[PDB]
Structure formats: C-alpha cells, structure tokens
Amino acid sequence: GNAASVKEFLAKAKEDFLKKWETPSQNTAQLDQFDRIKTLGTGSFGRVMLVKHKESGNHYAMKILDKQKVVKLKQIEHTLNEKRILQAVNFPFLVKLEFSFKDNSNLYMVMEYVAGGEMFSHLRRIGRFSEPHARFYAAQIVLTFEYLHSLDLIYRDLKPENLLIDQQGYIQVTDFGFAKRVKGRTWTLCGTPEYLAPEIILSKGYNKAVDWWALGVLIYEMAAGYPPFFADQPIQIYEKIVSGKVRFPSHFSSDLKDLLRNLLQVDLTKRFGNLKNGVNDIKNHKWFATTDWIAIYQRKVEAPFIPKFKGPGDTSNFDDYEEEEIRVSINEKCGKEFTEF
Amino acid sequence: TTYADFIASGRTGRRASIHD
Ligand SMILES: Nc1ncnc2c1ncn2[C@@H]1O[C@H](COP(=O)(O)OP(=O)(O)O)[C@@H](O)[C@H]1O
Ligand SMILES: [Mg+2]
Ligand SMILES: [Mg+2]
C-alpha cells in the first residue's frame, strides 16, 4: 500500500473507492510481459509466483488462478469480488494490485512484491511476539479494518498466512479472496478454521463482527505462539470455538486478557468493534494506551523487526514450493463465468 | 504445557482456507 479528521478522511477515501468500484480496471497486462521466477506461496485457490516485469525490470507477485478449479471450488463470485475490490482500494497496509488479466485457462492478479515473508513463518520460527511487538501489527490491522468496514467491505480471511512483512517491517494485508462489499448480513461459509467466529460455524447470518473476532484470534496467536482454539481436525476446533471458553498464557498482561475477552466475545451485543462506539472501543482500550494511531498510519514508528533482503528478487524469507508448469489451453474456458474479470 | 501440545499437533504448518 502507498504511504500517507477521521470521519473526513474516510469520506474522501470512500469517494476514491466508489469511482474504481463502479468502473474497474481490466486487462492491463499479458502473460508474456513477465518472466516467471519462483513460487512464493499457495493457498486453497491460487499459486503466487515472483515474476520479473521485462519492460520495467520490476519484480512482482503474480497470483495465478485456474478458472476450472475456481468453478469446482464454488469461488466464481468470490474471485470477481476479490479482483474488483482489490483494484479499487488504497491503504498503507493493503497490498497494491498492479495489473490483472486472463487467458484461455487462468486468471492473473499482479500485486506489488512484499519480500519480508509471511508473518506466519516469522511467528512460528521465533515462537511468539512480545506484547509490544504484537501490538504494533495489531494496530495496523485495526486501522485497516476501520478503512475496509467504512467502505462496507468485509475481509473474512485474517491470519498470519495472509499477512506479509514489508521492507520497513510494516504489515501488508494480502488475499482478498473472501472480501465482499455488503451492507447487510451475509451467509457464505468461508475463512480459515482457527479464525472462524461462532456465528459462522453455526451457519447464522453474520457481518463485519467476524473480522473483529478474527482480530482477537490473531492477537492471541501472535502473543501466545499458538491460537486460542486448536486441535488436529477442524471439527474439534469448531467445538472449542462455539463453547467460547478461552484460557490465556500466564505471561499475558491484564490489559491484553481484558481486550481479548471483549474481542473473542460470543455475544454480538458485547463484542468490541460491533458496539455503538464502533472501532473506538478498541482504539481507546488500555492495551493500546501507548499506541499513537496517527504515527502508525504515517509509518513513523520504528518496526520491531526488519526483514533481511539480500537484494531484489530475494525470496529467502519464503519457504520453497514444488513448481508446476503454467499451461494455457488452446480453447477458452469458462469465458462467460469470468467475462467481467 | 499448551505449547508442547500445540507443537505436537497436526496443524502447526500453514493453514489452507475453507469453503462450501
Ligand atoms: N503480494 C504478495 N507478495 C508476496 N507474497 C504474496 C503476495 N500475495 C500472496 N503471497 C503469498 O502467496 C500465498 C497465497 O496467496 P493467497 O492470495 O493467500 O492465496 P489463496 O487465496 O489461495 O490463499 C500467501 O499466503 C503468501 O505466502
Ligand atoms: Mg491466502
Ligand atoms: Mg484466499
């Protein structure tokens, strides 16, 4: 995301968003304009590869989606949401979508390359983040959700795997696959097991409150080293989540435990972020007392950790993945389904 | 310890997103 009252700021931000949202960019590049280098990561739906833009010499992260696979996994409308929303947003902590296009077989989304690696790998290696360290990343997510929700957007897949550390040690939110612009309630079952709010698991209509619940899980996992609800199988995780019972590590400060009880709140009439006071219930909470929200947004705060970059094109901060040949059919596939992409 | 239980569990690696 591009680097840099509130009610006024969000007013102008919304104006900018609606313009792109109403008239999305389309077909702004083609496959042969890039040199495919290496796979940076994969999810249930796509493969993201580090690519080299021939003309500019710039390095990018290209997300590749097989149209037939998208259809099989019932992600047609989600994928259209993903591209349409990502090409319209603009925030310091949101990954920037540089180009997008398609061919007979796949869909392509070329984003800025965030070389710091997944928060996930750094978190697992180090074990856990100290409260001040976790707070840093947390604040950025809080501000990012304030921005997204103000645009009537629900994110729906917050997790360390979908969060990247940039060269300045700041967070970049990627993967807008489940992002959706919705005013009222929505019902699709999606997200990641460990991060699902109770209302999603119980097939109830839900709203942006699930994102605040997800934030609770993220903060807990960052500070504890493990999630608040874990098991060997998703079903077992779901049982723990709905029961709501949460136990905190003995090293968790009083302020952190109080905030978490308010975020990992099964009762929607009490879950922070969803109350009458909106996001301020979180931003004014004690655990964030030392947080200077404007400084964070302006990226004037010193990052707790700055990733090592042995130069451009360096992928040492990412695990290695099995590579697969990107074949393109001679026959167009699912043309009608993705006509607006 | 809880950490020991987590580390020994089957979901300590990257977690895939779920859907219908
Ligand atoms: N802009 C990016 N820069 C660097 N790595 C990225 C970027 N976007 C995604 N990735 C990597 O690719 C992985 C898969 O991307 P994602 O969009 O999450 O796929 P899926 O939607 O199937 O989860 C991420 O977990 C991350 O490791
Ligand atoms: Mg993902
Ligand atoms: Mg996704």
Q: Where are chain A's structural domains?
A: 1-23+118-308, 24-117+309-337
Type and span of the H or E element at A112: strand A106-112
Pick the closest to residue A329 from A106, A101, A63 (CA basis).
A106
Q: Return the ∠ at Cα A16 (arms to A13 and A18), rounded to 5°.
A: 105
CB A64 within 8 A of CB A49: yes
**Closest partner CB to B6 (pick from A75, A118, A230):** A230
Distance from C-alpha of A301 to C-alpha of A326, rounded to nearest angstrom: 41
The CATH superfamily label for domain A24-117+309-337 reads Phosphorylase Kinase; domain 1 (3.30.200.20)
Pick the closest to residue A61 from A111, A9, A108, A116 (CA basis).
A111
Pick the closest to residue A200 from A212, A190, A208 (CA basis).
A190
The ligand with the least distance to the CA atom of A86 is 1
Distance from C-alpha of A141 to C-alpha of A293, rounded to nearest angstrom: 11
Q: Which residues of A touch B20 (CB under 8 A)?
A: 74, 188-190
CB A341 within 8 A of CB A78: no
**Closest partner CB to B11 (pick from A177, A230, A247):** A230
Q: Which atom of ligand 1 is nearest to the CA of A118?
A: 27
- Residue indicated by tokens 């993201």: A48
- Residue indicated by tokens 């949202």: A21
**Closest partner CB to A225 (pick from B3, B14, B20):** B3
Q: Which of A157, A175, A211, A281 is catalytic?
A: A157
If you measure from the C-alpha of residue A160 to the centroid of ligand 3, how many angstroms do you get, rounded to a whole number? 12
Answer whether A61 contacts ligand 1 (Cβ < 6 A).
yes
Q: Which residues of B touch A47 (CB under 8 A)?
A: none
A234 reaches B (C-beta below 8 A): yes
Distance from C-alpha of A38 to C-alpha of A82, rounded to nearest angstrom: 23
CB A154 within 8 A of CB A180: yes
Instruction: Give the method of determination.
Output: X-ray
A126 reaches B (C-beta below 8 A): no
B9 reaches A (C-beta below 8 A): yes
Beta carbons of B2 and A120 less than 8 Å apart? no
Give Cα separations from A1 to A7, A96, A237, A309 (angstroms): 21, 5, 33, 19
Distance from C-alpha of A216 to C-alpha of A25, rounded to nearest angstrom: 35
Distance from C-alpha of A171 to C-alpha of A162, rounded to nearest angstrom: 10
Distance from C-alpha of A211 to C-alpha of A11, rounded to nearest angstrom: 22
Type and span of the H or E element at A219: helix A209-224
Architecture label for domain A1-23+118-308? Orthogonal Bundle (1.10)
CB A34 within 8 A of CB A60: yes
Is residue A314 part of the annotated active site? The answer reads no
Biggest CA–CA distance in chain B, Å, is 35
Beta strand spans in chain B (E) = none
Beta carbons of A249 and B9 less than 8 Å apart? no
CB A248 within 8 A of CB A261: no
How many CB atoms are located within 10 Å of the residue A332 CB? 14
Q: Environment class of residue A280 by beta-carbon count within 10 Å: exposed (0-12), middle (13-18) or buried (19+)?
A: middle
Beta carbons of A74 and B19 less than 8 Å apart? yes
A194 reaches B (C-beta below 8 A): yes
For A21, the token pair is 């949202």
Distance from C-alpha of A26 to C-alpha of A33, rounded to nearest angstrom: 16
Pick the closest to residue B12 from A165, A305, A137, A127 (CA basis).
A127
Beta carbons of B2 and A74 less than 8 Å apart? no
